[PDB]
Amino acid sequence: MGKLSEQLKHCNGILKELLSKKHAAYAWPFYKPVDASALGVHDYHDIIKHPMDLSTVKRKMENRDYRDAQEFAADVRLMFSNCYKYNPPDHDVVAMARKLQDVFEFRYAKMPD
Ligand SMILES: C[C@H](O)COCC(CO)(COC[C@@H](C)O)COC[C@@H](C)O
Ligand SMILES: C[C@H](O)COC[C@H](C)O
Ligand SMILES: [Cl-]
């Protein structure tokens, strides 16, 4: 598949961290694709045109779908944005998203040049 670039190695590290036990208390809703029918959110796919979640990001990284760090970051941010779009701003899951996004943005900002 070829070695990830230095920047994508950093991205992969961030991704592993987002999936790790120490963040699980707020990361878990983002682990897998939203199963709209299971949750009874029958409007989800009308509102969210481009679903994204951490398992999908992981598969894309493994498959070398991301050609650079920017493409990776856009997907992670899309995942958070979908949460902010679908849910009311006082929802517990929105607070979880904000916390995980803090983890993400601060470490993404430490990207090697
Ligand atoms: C503390 C609990 O209320 C957290 O609920 C999460 C869930 C239920 O497991 C899944 O959220 C997935 C994110 C990606 O939106 C909230 O589900 C409602 C819509 C899908 O957000
Ligand atoms: C909570 C906002 O949607 C995302 O903020 C990220 C910042 C690094 O805390
Ligand atoms: Cl972006």
Numbering used by the authors: 343 to 455
What does the paper say about this structure?
In previous work we have explored the potential for establishing a bump-&-hole system targeting the bromodomains of the BET (bromo and extra-terminal) protein family. These four human proteins – BRD2, BRD3, BRD4 and BRDT – each contain two tandem bromodomains that bind acetylated lysine residues in histone tails, leading to the recruitment of multi-protein complexes to chromatin. Through this function the BET proteins play a significant role in controlling transcription and regulating gene expression. Through structural analysis of the bromodomain we hypothesized that a leucine/valine substitution (L/V) would be a more conservative change than the previous L/A substitution, resulting in a smaller ‘hole’ but still allowing enough space to accommodate a bumped ligand.
The L/V mutation typically decreased the affinity of the peptide:bromodomain interaction by around two-fold, which is close to experimental errors and a significant improvement over the L/A mutation which showed up to 10-fold decreases in affinity. Analysis of the thermodynamic parameters of binding (ΔH, TΔS, ΔG) suggested that the L/V mutation does not substantially impact the binding mode of these peptides. The conformation of the ZA loop in the L/V mutant structure superposes very well with that of the WT (so-called “open” conformation), which differs from that observed in the L/A mutant, which is in a closed conformation. However, differences in crystallization space group and consequently crystal packing around the ZA loop amongst the various crystal structures might also contribute to the different conformations observed for the ZA loop.
